[PDB]
Coordinates of C-alpha atoms in Angstrom, one line a residue:
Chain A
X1 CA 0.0 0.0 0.0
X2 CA 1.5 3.3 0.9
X3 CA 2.7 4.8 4.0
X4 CA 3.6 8.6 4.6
X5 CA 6.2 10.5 5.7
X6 CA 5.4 10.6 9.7
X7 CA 4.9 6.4 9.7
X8 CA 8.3 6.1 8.3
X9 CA 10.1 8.4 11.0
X10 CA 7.6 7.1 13.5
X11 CA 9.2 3.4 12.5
X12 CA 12.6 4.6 12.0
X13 CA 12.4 6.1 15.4
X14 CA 11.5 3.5 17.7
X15 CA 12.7 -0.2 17.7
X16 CA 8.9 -1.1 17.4
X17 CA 9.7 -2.8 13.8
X18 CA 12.7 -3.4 11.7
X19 CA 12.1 -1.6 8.6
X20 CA 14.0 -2.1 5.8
X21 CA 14.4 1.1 3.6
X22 CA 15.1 1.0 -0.5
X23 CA 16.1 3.8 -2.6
X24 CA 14.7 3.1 -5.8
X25 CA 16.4 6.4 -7.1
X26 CA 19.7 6.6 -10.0
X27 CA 23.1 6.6 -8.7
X28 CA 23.5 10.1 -8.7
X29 CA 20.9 11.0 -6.7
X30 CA 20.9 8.5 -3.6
X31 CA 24.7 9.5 -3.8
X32 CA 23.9 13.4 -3.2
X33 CA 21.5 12.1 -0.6
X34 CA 19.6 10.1 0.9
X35 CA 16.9 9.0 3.8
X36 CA 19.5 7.7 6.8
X37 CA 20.2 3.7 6.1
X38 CA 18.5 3.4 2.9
X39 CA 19.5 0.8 0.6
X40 CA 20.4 1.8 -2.8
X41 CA 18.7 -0.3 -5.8
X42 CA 19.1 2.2 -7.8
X43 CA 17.3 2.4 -11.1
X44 CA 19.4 1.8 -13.6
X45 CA 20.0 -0.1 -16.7
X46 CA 21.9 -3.0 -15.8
X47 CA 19.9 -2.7 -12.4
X48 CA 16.3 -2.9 -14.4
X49 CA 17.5 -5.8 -16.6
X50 CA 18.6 -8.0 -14.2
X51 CA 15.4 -7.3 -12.1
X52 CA 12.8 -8.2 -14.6
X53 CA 15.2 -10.9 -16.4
X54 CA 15.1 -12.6 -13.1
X55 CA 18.7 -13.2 -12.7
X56 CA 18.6 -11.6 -8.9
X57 CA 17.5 -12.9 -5.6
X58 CA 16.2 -9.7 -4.4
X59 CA 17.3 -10.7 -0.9
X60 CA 20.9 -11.2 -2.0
X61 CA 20.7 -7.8 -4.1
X62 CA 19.4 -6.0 -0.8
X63 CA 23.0 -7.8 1.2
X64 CA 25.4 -6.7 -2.0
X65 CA 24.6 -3.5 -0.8
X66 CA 24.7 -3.0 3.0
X67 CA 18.6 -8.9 8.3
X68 CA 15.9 -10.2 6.1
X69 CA 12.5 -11.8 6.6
X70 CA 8.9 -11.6 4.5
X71 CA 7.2 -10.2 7.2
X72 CA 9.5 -7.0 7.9
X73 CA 8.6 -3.9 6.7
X74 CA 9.7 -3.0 3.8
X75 CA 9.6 1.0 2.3
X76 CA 10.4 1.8 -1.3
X77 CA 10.8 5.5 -2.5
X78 CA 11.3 7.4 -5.3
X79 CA 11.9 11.0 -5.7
X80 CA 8.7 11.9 -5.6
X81 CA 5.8 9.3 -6.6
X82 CA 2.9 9.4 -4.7
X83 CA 0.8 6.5 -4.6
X84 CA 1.1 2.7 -6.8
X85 CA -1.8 3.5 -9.2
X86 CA 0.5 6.5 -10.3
X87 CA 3.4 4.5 -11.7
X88 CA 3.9 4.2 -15.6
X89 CA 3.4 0.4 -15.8
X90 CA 6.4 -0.2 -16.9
X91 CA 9.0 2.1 -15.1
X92 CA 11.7 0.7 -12.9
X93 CA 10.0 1.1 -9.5
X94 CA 7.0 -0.3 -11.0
X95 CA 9.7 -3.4 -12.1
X96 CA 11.0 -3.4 -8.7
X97 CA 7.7 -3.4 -7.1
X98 CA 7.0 -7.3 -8.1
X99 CA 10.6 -8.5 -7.1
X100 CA 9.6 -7.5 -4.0
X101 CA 6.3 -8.4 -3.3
X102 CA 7.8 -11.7 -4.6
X103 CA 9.6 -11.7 -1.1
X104 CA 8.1 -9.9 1.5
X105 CA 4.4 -9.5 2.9
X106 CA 4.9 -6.0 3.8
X107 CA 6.2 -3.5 1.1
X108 CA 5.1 0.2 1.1
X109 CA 5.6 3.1 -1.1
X110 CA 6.8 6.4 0.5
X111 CA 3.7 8.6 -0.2
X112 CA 5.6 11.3 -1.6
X113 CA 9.0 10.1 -2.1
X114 CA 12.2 11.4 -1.2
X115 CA 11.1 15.4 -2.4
X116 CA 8.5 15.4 0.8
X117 CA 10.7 13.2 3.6
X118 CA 13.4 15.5 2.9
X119 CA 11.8 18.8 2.7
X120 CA 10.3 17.5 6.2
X121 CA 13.1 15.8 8.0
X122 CA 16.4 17.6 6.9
X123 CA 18.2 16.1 9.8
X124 CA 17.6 11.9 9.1
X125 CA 19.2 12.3 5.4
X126 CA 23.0 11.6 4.8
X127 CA 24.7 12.7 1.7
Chain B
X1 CA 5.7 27.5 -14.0
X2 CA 3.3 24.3 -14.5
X3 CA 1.8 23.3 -17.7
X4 CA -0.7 20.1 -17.1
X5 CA -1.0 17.0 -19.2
X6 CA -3.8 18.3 -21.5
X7 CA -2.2 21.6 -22.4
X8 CA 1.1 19.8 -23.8
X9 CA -1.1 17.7 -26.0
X10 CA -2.6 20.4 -27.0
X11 CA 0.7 22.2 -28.1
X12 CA 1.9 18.9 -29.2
X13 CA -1.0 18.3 -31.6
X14 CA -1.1 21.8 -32.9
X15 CA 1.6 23.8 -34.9
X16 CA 0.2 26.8 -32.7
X17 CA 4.0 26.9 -31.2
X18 CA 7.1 24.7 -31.2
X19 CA 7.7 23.2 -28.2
X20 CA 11.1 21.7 -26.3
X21 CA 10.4 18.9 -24.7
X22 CA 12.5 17.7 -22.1
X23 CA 12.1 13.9 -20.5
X24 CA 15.2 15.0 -17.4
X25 CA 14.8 10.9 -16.5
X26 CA 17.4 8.4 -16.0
X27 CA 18.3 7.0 -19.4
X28 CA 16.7 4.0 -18.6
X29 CA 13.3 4.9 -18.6
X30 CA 13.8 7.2 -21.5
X31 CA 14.3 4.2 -23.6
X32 CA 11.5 2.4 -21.9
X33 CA 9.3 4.9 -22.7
X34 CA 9.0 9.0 -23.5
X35 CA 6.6 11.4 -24.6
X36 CA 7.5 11.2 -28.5
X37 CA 10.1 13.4 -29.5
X38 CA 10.8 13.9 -25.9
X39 CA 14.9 15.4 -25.7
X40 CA 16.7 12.7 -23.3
X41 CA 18.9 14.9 -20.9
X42 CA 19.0 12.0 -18.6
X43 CA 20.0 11.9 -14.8
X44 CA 23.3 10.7 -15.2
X45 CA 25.6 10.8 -12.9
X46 CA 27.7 12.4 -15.7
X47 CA 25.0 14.8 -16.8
X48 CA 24.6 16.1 -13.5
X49 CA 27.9 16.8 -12.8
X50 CA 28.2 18.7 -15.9
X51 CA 25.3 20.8 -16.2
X52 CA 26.2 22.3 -12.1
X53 CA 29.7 22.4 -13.2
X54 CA 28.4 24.9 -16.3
X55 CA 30.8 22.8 -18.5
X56 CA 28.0 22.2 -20.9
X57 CA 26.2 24.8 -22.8
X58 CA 22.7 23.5 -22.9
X59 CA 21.4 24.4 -26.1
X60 CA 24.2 22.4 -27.6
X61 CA 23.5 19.5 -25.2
X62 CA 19.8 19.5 -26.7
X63 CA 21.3 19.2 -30.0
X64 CA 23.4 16.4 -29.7
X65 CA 20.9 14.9 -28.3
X66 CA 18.5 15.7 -30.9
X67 CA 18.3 12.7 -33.0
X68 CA 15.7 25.3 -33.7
X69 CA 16.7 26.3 -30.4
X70 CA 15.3 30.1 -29.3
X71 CA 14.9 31.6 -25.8
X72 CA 10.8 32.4 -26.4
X73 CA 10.4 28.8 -27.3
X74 CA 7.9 26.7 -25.2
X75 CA 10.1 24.5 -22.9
X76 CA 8.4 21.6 -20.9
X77 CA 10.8 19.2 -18.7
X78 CA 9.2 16.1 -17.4
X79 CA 10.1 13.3 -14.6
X80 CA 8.2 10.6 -13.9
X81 CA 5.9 12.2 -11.4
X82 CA 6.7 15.2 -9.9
X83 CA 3.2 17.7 -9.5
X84 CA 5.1 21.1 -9.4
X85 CA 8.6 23.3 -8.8
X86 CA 7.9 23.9 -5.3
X87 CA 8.1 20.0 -4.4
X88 CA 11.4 19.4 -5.8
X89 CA 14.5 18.5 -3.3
X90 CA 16.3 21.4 -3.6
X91 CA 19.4 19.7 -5.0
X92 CA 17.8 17.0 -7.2
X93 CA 19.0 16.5 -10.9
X94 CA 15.6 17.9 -11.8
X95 CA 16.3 21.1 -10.3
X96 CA 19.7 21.9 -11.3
X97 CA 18.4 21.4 -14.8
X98 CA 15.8 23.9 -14.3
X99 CA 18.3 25.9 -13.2
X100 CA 20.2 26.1 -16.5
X101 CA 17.4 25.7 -18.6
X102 CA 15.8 29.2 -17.2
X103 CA 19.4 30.5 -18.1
X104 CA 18.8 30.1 -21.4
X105 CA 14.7 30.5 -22.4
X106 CA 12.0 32.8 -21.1
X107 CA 9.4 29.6 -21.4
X108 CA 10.4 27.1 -19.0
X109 CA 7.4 25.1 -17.6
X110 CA 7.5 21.5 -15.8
X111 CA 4.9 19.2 -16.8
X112 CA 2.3 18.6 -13.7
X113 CA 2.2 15.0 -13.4
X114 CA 5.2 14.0 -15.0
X115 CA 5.2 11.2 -17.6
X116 CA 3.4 8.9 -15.1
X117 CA 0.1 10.8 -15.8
X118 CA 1.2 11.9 -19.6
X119 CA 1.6 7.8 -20.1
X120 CA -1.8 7.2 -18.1
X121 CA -3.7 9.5 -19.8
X122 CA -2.1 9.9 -23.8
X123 CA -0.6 6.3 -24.2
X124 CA -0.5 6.5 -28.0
X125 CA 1.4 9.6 -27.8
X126 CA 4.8 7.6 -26.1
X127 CA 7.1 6.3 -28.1
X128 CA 9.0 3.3 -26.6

């Protein structure tokens, strides 16, 4: 489904859940910067064909880049997407979307994407 | 400013004006899909660096990636679903490309919706 800005900081907050955070976004831009601990799968050519070739255990993707289990949270984000029914159907989140509701129960879009979080929480974004 | 979905079609379809467009997406998506005869000035790692680094005159970036350039001409930049100027990052790839784009042409306006809503609403009109 989706979940907004004040659930993810809420989560990220407390030790209530283990939330694991992806950064759907190029390269370049988790690089500049970036929501504290998130997990670069960045959207990218090779990235996007190995996705939807299924070549890649999404699970060992997430580990070539920094604890995983279906039921954890699980928060995707783009720059600045809003909601699921607003993705082109075939764009790379979109792509990534299914890998991961291939693996995991829980998986969220940030309702507003990484424009919103970090106009709203300056502070939890490393670059 | 903003220029929703329906008023690009509508410049698209007429020869009223001649219209820039931009698609600023990773290169991926481009080739995916774009509004047609959308200008790829993908976020690049590369491209990013050089347009903040003013190493790249952008007029002659549009033309090389062309396949009539003029400061009054409409100029539309697109992501995937950004709604308007105020909610972009402040140092996104998006935004520094508005930056330089505004340097050059008096008609600057980002499509409300991005290509997300474009590609909803016109799908005939992507090329892919």
């Amino acid at each position: 489904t989706q979940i907004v800005t004040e659930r993810l900081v809420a989560l990220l907050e407390s030790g209530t859940e283990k939330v694991l955070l992806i950064d759907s976004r190029p390269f370049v831009e988790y690089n500049t910067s970036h929501i504290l601990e998130a997990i670069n799968i960045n959207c990218s050519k090779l990235m996007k064909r190995r996705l939807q070739q299924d070549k890649v255990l999404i699970t060992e993707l997430i580990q070539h880049s920094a604890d995983i289990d279906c039921s954890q949270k699980v928060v995707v984000y783009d720059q600045s997407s809003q909601d699921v029914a607003s993705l082109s159907s075939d764009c790379f989140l979109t792509v990534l979307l299914g890998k991961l509701e291939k693996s995991f129960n829980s998986v969220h879009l940030l309702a507003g994407g990484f424009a919103e979080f970090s106009r709203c929480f300056p502070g939890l974004c490393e670059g």
